[PDB]
C-alpha cells in the first residue's frame, strides 16, 4: 500500500491511502484516535495511533498486550480489529502501530446526558454491556475500570466495551474492592460498575459521586449498609480496617425507595449487582437471564470466547523481544470478513 502523511493532534500520522478523511475524535488508552473513511469497503472506521509504543518495557509490553487482546476479541459488543498496520517495511524500522475498528461516534455519557431514556432503552444498553462482559469474562479477561466513557455507542445505541484488560480518572464506577485495594477480587468487579452505570441511566444522577476515596466509601455504605467482619478479611491495611470497623453502623437501604418509579425488575437487578460481597454479586451470564432483559435475551446469541492464552503476562522480556512479538502479530493479522453474521 501507498502511505501518506498528515499532521493530526500535533503529530504526523502515516496511514495507507485506503483510509481517508482522518479527523480527530479523542484520546484512547495509550494513544489517540481519528475517524476515517475506509475506501475499500465504504465503511467508517476509527484508527488509534499508539503513543510511543516501544519507549520502555512498560510501553512495549502494553502494546503487545493490547494487540493480542484486540486480535482475540470477536463479539458484537466488544471492540475488535478490522485492521492493524505500520508504515514500517521491516522490524528494524518498526516503531509505530495503528489499530482500526468500526467507528462508534459517541460514548455512553453522550446518550445519558440530554435525554430521559425510556426503560426499554436502558434495558437494551445494559443488556449489551452484560453480553460483552459475559464474553470477555469467559476468556478470563476483566475490565477493572468499566465506566460510561469506556462504552462506545453508535447512532443506533449499539454499544461496545473498550479499554478492558489493560490524567485523573473518575473512580465513581469502580468496584469497592478495586478502589480500596482489597487483597482479592474476581470478574464481578465489573458488575458493580454496571450497577452504578444502570442506576445513573435510570435516575439521571451519579450514584456515588464521592470527592475522595473516603467520601466515596461513605456514600456506598449509606446505600448498601455497613459490612460484616467477614469483609474485613479482604483488606490488608490495619488502619483501613480499623476505620471501617469504627464507622457508625448503617442499615442497607430499600432500593425501591431509592429508585422511586423505576421498573421493579430494574430495582431487583440493581439489588443483585450492588452488593459489597463480590462472591455474592450476580455474574454477567446470570444477569443476562434476569427478567429485566426478557425482551432482548437470546441464549443462542450470547456467546463465550475462545480460550485466550495469557501466559505472556508473567514473563519479563527485553524491549526488542516485545517489539518483535508485536511485529509478528501485526504481520499475521487476518482481517475478518465484512459480513460475519447470519439471520437467526
Ligand atoms: N470513535 C471511536 N470509535 C471506535 C473506537 C474508538 C476508540 C478507541 C479505539 C480502540 C481500538 C481501535 F482499534 C480503534 C479505536 N480507543 C478509544 N476510543 C474512543 C472511545 C470514546 N472516547 C473517544 C475515544 N473511538
Ligand atoms: Ca493484565
Ligand atoms: Ca435474537
Ligand atoms: Ca449477513
Ligand atoms: Ca449491523
Ligand atoms: Ca435461535
Ligand atoms: Cl466515565
Ligand atoms: Cl489495604
Curated annotation (Swiss-Prot):
Residues 19-293 form the Protein kinase domain. Macrophages, monocytes, T- and B-lymphocytes. Isoform 2 is specifically expressed in kidney and liver. The modification Phosphotyrosine is found at residues 167, 308. CDD domains: STKc_p38alpha. Activated by cell stresses such as DNA damage, heat shock, osmotic shock, anisomycin and sodium arsenite, as well as pro-inflammatory stimuli such as bacterial lipopolysaccharide (LPS) and interleukin-1. Its EC number is 2.7.11.24. The active site is at residue 163. Belongs to the protein kinase superfamily. CMGC Ser/Thr protein kinase family. MAP kinase subfamily. Serine/threonine kinase which acts as an essential component of the MAP kinase signal transduction pathway. MAPK14 is one of the four p38 MAPKs which play an important role in the cascades of cellular responses evoked by extracellular stimuli such as pro-inflammatory cytokines or physical stress leading to direct activation of transcription factors. Accordingly, p38 MAPKs phosphorylate a broad range of proteins and it has been estimated that they may have approximately 200 to 300 substrates each. This is Mitogen-activated protein kinase 14. It comes from Mus musculus (Mouse). The gene is Mapk14.
